[PDB]
Amino acid sequence: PDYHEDIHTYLREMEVKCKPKVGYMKKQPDITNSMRAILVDWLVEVGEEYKLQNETLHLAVNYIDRFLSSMSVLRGKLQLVGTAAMLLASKFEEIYPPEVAEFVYITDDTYTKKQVLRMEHLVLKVLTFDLAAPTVNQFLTQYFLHQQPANCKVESLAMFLGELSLIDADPYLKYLPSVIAGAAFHLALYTVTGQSWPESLIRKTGYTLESLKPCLMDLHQTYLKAPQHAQQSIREKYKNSKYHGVSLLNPPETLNL
């Protein structure tokens, strides 16, 4: 009942506190957005390799963006930062995480176990143990309850569009998780069933359809050009029958807004 409203209210309040500096990459001397894209895409496959939850993947990216907001990192250490964030996210979300050795092994033994564990220490200190961060995944979950005629294809397509936004920092670091989730839900609902962002959520989130329009335009473009993107791990992920092959769905030509 109401503790669902209090949760949505609390997540909305906490998502503002856990947001990274939007333009931190411009102040990063050695790493670029493309390298970040390569990192998160690699993390998509390690989560797929070790059969980890989608929330674990989302959390790790959040950790990475916040860490890189405060700390300047060279190219050769970027993967180490992402690995520790993945291990920490695994410790938070999974019932039990993969062993540290698995994370050392998955990096092709680029770093040692002690490098991983001390990077974990550093990330924990930099993030000040604030690991329970709200994600697009979490808001999608909250939104889905307002889809009483639940559609697995809509939910799967929304997750797909949500995961794709993790890859590119250039447009999506300036949108809150709740807003990204809003655009992803509408776009999926529109593609699969041809209907729109419902009133119950407009009442719930306060977001009008037009308030989501800027994020919705960006996400629809990511959807359209997803076949041509340099990173393809998520698309391959959502071709499998588990996600009803929603990635193979032809996105609509326009959205009529």
């Binding site: 790493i31 493309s34 390690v46 390799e49 993967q79 998955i106 990096t107 092709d108 680029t110």
Partner: peptide, 7 residues
């Protein structure tokens, strides 16, 4: 999967 990110 198992690889070293070459950027």
């Amino acid at each position: 999967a198992r690889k070293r990110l070459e950027l």
